[PDB]
Ligand binder design. Sequence first.
Ligand SMILES: CC(C)[C@H]1CC[C@H](C(=O)N[C@H](Cc2ccccc2)C(=O)O)CC1
Length: 558
Amino acid sequence: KSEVAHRFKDLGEENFKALVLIAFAQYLQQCPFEDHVKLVNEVTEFAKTCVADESAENCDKSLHTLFGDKLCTVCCAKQEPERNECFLQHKDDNPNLPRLVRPEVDVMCTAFHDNEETFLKKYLYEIARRHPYFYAPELLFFAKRYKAAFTECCQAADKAACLLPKLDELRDEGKASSAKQRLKCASLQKFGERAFKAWAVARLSQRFPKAEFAEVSKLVTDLTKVHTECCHGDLLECADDRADLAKYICENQDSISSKLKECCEKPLLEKSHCIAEVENDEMPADLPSLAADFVESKDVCKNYAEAKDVFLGMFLYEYARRHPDYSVVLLLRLAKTYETTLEKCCAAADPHECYAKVFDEFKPLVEEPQNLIKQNCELFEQLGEYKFQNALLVRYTKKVPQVSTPTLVEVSRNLGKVGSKCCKHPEAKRMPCAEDYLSVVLNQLCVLHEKTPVSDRVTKCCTESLVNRRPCFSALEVDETYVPKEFNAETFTFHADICTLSEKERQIKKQTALVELVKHKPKATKEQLKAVMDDFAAFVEKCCKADDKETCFAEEGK
Ligand SMILES: CC(C)[C@H]1CC[C@H](C(=O)N[C@H](Cc2ccccc2)C(=O)O)CC1
């Protein structure tokens, strides 16, 4: 059994070289590009000697030992069981690498015709460094779209008018995938398979309400294996198991969903990406109420005593089928309440009288997120995306001013994008959009704060139950124990480079200074904050509009 030969023959050389490069760029993010390509080539040539003869020397070594040794040719404490854990824990979610600049379209198109491999290979390299938890088989799909964009646009007349829209759309699609995937790995490493499996049975039951529980259970167990391998660095094992899972869904389509026909006729990488973004299938007609099998039955505690989690999974499956308008987080709350009740009632002398009114306890839990979305969307339309982000900046920096300024401006801008993405939807699609998107933005705050814990209040909010992560953050309130920071003249002084920056890069500078102003005066009236912001907003365009640009900038020193 040669694991390096098994993965090579299942994935093929092209994906093998790509998946091995990604793993190296995520384990050693600070190592240069050309050094990793030399390691990947040597690895790929070694896999060829093992597909020919599986009994050749070192072919029996595991992928962890092979990749660990090849990496440490440049934390490597002998034993491989712990050496792979040193690499995973030292992954830097903000590795402090230089921000990538995009050259002109003719500079990139010439590099695309010159050497197409190293141009696209360096694309997978630079991305895997910045996003060390990126869904590996999903990054191969983004690479193909990044190649088709240059293949089509560089032969077009106006190459810039063609390439820039497709590259800007790909950039935003990638940042969202990385955020969604980082959440999947946090729920596994910090909460276990049970937490992730429950998430999977809820999201898939809404997506596949036609499928039976055994069909959903098989998909969930296989999908958990894929993401457990992908989050633990087993990228070759991850992309192999994902392809086999996509083959099963397509060879058993009528047992899963009806919106899988056009997905199962695309190429391999498109096939898996198509199923991950498929619309929720229609609910089967005439579904009985859950009270018959979960409350009004005399065999509720009998079936629950055999396998509690399997019974709880059936309850979550049956409840998630009938409510595609509920968020996954809400569906986990209704399933945990039904669990707490069964634990109390199945030990009593009359469990039927005890859990007869458990479904009434779900009614208050449903209306809590419905009030969160309706109130904030009504304020989003009145403010606009840019004013909604600024109002969230001053509000949340008063709740927790210990969090660093780049983190506060980061998660506040992403909450404005939740209003731009979900508030347009009706009240039906508002809850699974907003509450689940709100889950991945808070996960950014948690992870970015986990690197340097400054506020113990946020840490307790992240370390507790992730299902209760949104309600714990609502009840923070202003932190009066924090003392205002002394005024720094360099944080308010601007540079002449503010002209060359884009409007989005220039408005981030202004949202940064807003956070530094509230950290200097936490007890600042909402009227006095807009007066200081609008005053510097005038000096940003007025001083740049003059011939002596940087000269008038210094004149505003007081
Ligand atoms: C649907 C959108 C308009 C969205 C906008 C923000 C709003 C919200 O208030 N979120 C906070 C999260 C938080 C807590 C503390 C610090 C930083 C963020 C919470 O209350 O959980 C929820 C809906």
